A paper describes a structure:
In plants, protein synthesis is realized by eukaryotic 80S ribosomes in the cytosol and 70S-type ribosomes of prokaryotic origin in chloroplasts and mitochondria. To elucidate the structural basis of cytosolic translation in plants, we report the cryo-electron microscopy (cryo-EM) structure of actively translating cytosolic 80S ribosomes in a rotated conformation (rotated-2 state) from the model plant tobacco ([name]) at a global resolution of 2.2 Å. This resolution allowed us not only to build the correct atomic coordinates for rRNA and RPs in the 80S ribosome but also to describe ribosome solvation and metal ion positions, as well as chemical modifications of rRNA residues.
Moreover, in our structure, the 3′-CCA end of the A/P tRNA is nicely resolved, enabling unambiguous visualization of its interaction with the peptidyl transferase centre. The stacking of residues C74, C75 and A76 and the formation of Watson–Crick base pairs of C74 and C75 with residues of the [name] (Gm2622 and G2623) are observed. A76 is tightly packed between Gm2796 and G2797 of the [name], while C75 forms π-stacking with Tyr43 of eL42. Another region of the 80S ribosome that is enriched in modified nucleotides is the peptidyl transferase centre, located at the heart of the LSU. The modified nucleotide m5C2873 forms the non-canonical base pairing with the key nucleotide A2822, which in turn supports the proper positioning of the A76 nucleotide. By contrast, in the tobacco cryo-EM map, only the N-terminal domain of eL24 (amino acids 2–63), which is buried within the bottom of the 60S subunit, is structured, while the parts that are responsible for interaction with the components of the SSU (eS6, ES12S and h10) are not visualized. The pronounced presence of plant-specific elements in the tobacco 80S ribosome is seen in the back of the LSU and associated with three expansion segments (ESs) of the [name]: ES7L, ES39L and ES15L. The plant ES7Lc helix splits into two additional branches (ES7Ld and e), forming a three-way junction stabilized by the N-terminal end of the eukaryote-specific eL6 protein, similar to human and Drosophila.
Numbering used by the authors:
A (entry chain G): 2 to 125
B (entry chain s): 305 to 404
C (entry chain q): 50 to 242
D (entry chain b): 3 to 161, 182 to 230
E (entry chain R): 2 to 127
The structure:
Amino acid sequence: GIDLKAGGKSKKTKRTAPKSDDVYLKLLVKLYRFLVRRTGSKFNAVILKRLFMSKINKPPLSLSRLISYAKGKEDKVVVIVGTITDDVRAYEVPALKVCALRFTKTARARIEKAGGECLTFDQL
Amino acid sequence: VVRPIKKDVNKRATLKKNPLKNLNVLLKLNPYAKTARRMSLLAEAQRVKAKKEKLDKKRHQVTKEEASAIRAAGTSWFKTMISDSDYTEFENFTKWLGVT
Amino acid sequence: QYAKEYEAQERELIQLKREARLKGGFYVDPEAKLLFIIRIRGINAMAPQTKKILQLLRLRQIFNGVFLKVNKATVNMLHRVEPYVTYGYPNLKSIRELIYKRGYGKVEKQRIALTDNSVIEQVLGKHGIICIEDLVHEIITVGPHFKEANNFLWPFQLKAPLGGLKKKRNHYVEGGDAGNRENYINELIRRMN
Amino acid sequence: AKKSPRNPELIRGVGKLSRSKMYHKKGLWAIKKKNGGSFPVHKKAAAVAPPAVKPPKFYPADDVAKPLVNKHKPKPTKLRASITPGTVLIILAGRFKGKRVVFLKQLKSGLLLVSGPFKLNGVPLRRVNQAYVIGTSTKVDISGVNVEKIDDKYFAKQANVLPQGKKDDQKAVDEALIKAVECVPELKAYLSARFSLKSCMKPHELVF
Amino acid sequence: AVPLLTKKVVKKRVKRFIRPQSDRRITVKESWRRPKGIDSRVRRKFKGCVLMPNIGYGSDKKTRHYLPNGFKKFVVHNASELEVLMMHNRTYCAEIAHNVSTRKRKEIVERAAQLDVVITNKLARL
RNA sequence: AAUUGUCGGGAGGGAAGCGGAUGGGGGCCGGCGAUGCGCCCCGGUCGGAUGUGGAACGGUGACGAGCCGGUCCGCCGAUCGACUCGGGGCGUGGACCAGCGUGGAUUGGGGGGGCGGCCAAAGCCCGGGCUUUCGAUACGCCCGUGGAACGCCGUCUCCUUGAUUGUGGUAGGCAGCGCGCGCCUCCGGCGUGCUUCGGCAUCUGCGCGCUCCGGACGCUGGCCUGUGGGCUCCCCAUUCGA
RNA sequence: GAUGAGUAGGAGGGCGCGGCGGUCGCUGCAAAACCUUGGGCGCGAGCCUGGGCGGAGCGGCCGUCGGUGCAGAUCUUGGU
Ligand SMILES: [K+]
Ligand SMILES: [K+]
Ligand SMILES: [K+]
Ligand SMILES: [K+]
Ligand SMILES: [K+]
Ligand SMILES: [K+]
Ligand SMILES: [Mg+2]
Ligand SMILES: [Mg+2]
Ligand SMILES: [Mg+2]
Ligand SMILES: [Mg+2]
């Protein structure tokens, strides 16, 4: 015998692929698997890991909070693995380059009217 | 931005050979083993030849006076090594122990 | 250079002993700085402290072997598990044969056979150890980087003794196998490697 | 061209001389001096362009696996020291089991060429595997026996009737062998008699 | 057809794993069932008792599911399904389904002979 | 299905049944186990340019131009190629099972040699002195750089053997080393440096090769419709277990 | 590369039965069911197939659903 816990095997479980059956999400996962393998970029690894997560683990971000966090960084492309919702409490919308898994219709309309763009992760 | 593609990562594991049996593996791990073996074999052959010829030299590492000093020191050390106690501390067992 | 150094140390020890005898005094040999520890009991019915110490020594299987630098902390740790192990002072031949025949390195927590000097280099090049002989010298001399080199060595998986054991339930002093058997560990290593 | 080896082998794979002595003996210094302090550079041999193989008539649906290279090459079979030309051998297997025969030479394939002689015990010129033979201490002169023209090809099948040429060759070979045998007294009877184990005879104790 | 397989087929066990006591009670069938009884000696693996299957008996992946002839089985119900093996005749053999009529079996056999596809039961219903 | 009769095989000293290993007998199996391949000669069929026209069409481009391209049909030259077409030659070749050879891995034995440590062994022997005994003719002590042969321990090496086994399949890699690129009188010798005076990875480069070198290859035989080979099937016997 | 015990208990991947929406098939040149010291595949649940009998239907695959898997319950009914 060998004095090991569970024969030296791991007892922690983590997501290794999306549980969803969305074909577009699967294609994005393939894209970022390739990117992670052939680039070794920490950002790409984080994106790939978040692509696996469940709905509650990909909470939405409000438009007002996005504007607040993008203050002074409007030249950078803001990336969120999740949904971006509109906020009726936000009055002035600047021109923002935003990439997300999905945009609500109102949020997309406001972002496009303000002069920004809404991007998908392949475009990113 | 992709790093160069890799094709020679999936190499089969090299079979482990004991360096103590086969020479090439030992030399690969330690090249000086070749020289060590050569010198050992040559020294053994020279010693065997000297023994067989019976023409061996008369080598004295230590001179006569220091050899005598060494012998005296060794004799004294042996004398103290084999020495015994007087057993005089056991007065009640003096007769039994053969002291008197 | 290492081979010359070993020969010089042996000659110096012999000369020191002879000179001490000539002067009429005594020469106290330097205390062993290195030990080899072999587990001789199984993993059944283990007391908590003994089990924890045996894990800390990396002895999880019967007849596993590991080197251990001599220290008050390490010696006191070994004193608690004495009944479960036997240990002594390994020879140069013992160390060399162990590393050559059963030496496995730990790279990224994996067990890789030391079939090339590159395996040793990849882990211990920062410390100047780039070859098998360098590793042997570091282990035997307990050099400044002994800890890293020793941890790099996977615990040795030794076979059952060729001639068997005497009695593993008793100390070596009583005629058993447990405990410090000092220079006689080398013959046991011969039979176990 | 050097007529003698520069570095005799103490053992297999180890030379008697070191790299410095080998440098001195090989004359690299002389070559450098003659060439002007620099070794002469030799161009790499040009590879032969592959022949224009005609296009295949068929295309397999599967990629056949090419075996990996094996760097080990077989060496010639060793001949036991106890077996030397003229040694008497005991056959332990086959239709001639127990027969005592004279050893002539070892062939290229490693098999042993032996003769009865044919007249004495009916054993012709034949090949016997060394693993099925015992070499004894009895030796007979075979210097006058000529078997140069006989080789492994002499016994090759051409695929019932023994040609007369083989009989004549066997007679010619056996004439000198019998002449040599007659010198040793009682050797004729010894070769005409088979070996057998009687009661309380232990193979591991017989010296042969 | 020359089979592509080269490694020899090795079976770790050729005996069936018969249910315990199926020899004793007629109502207990042979098909394997793992005992769950608290005292079951078979479950406890007492020596000299009925052996239980486990993953350790698994066949080598290279020779797994290979028939003794060196090919793998594929069931074909008509000649149209036979052409699927046209490019796999060195690894796959065709077995005609048990319910196919003799008339269709002849056509399947002829087509396979044309395609050099091995049929395991080409003599059935002849 | 339980259960029962008949016929046939088999077993049975106070249960039977069952797990593992062989064997006897039976039953079954021909994808159970091949006969092809390459190079030539003869004969028979079918087609043969990068040339010139026609039919439809494609890749790319921008379902434009331009460039490039295949299929089919008809012609002038070219006189070649193919055939699971036939005949004749040379070479080579299959599945399974054994024997043998040379080696790799792992492993258990046998026979030697060198060196070192010890009271710098102890003892024994050779000479120079001292000592003088009861198990009566001993125990003995040291002087020599005196001489052979051991003992134990450690260490470095050579040779020779039996057993199990070959996992992988695009690499001439890695390591070590020979021959040529100089000569002589060729068991070897000749140059520069450092040496403990033995020697040294100090000069050590190229081309061609060799090996204990990134996991087994080679030769031979037997047999192929047989009273052969195989078997996970069946009935039994035996050893162990139960 | 390391590693392998498991009652109560948890979970994953699979096997099997009967319908529904689709799809691909089989069948009087013989379907289902049943029978068989015929053969084979899978560690296994099971699966594929030879032969027989039977004489009119049946199956594979993707989803989806359920009155869906027995050795026991002094279990039920029937039979012996
Ligand atoms: K039953
Ligand atoms: K289990
Ligand atoms: K072998
Ligand atoms: K259907
Ligand atoms: K059946
Ligand atoms: K269904
Ligand atoms: Mg282990
Ligand atoms: Mg106890
Ligand atoms: Mg019945
Ligand atoms: Mg229902």
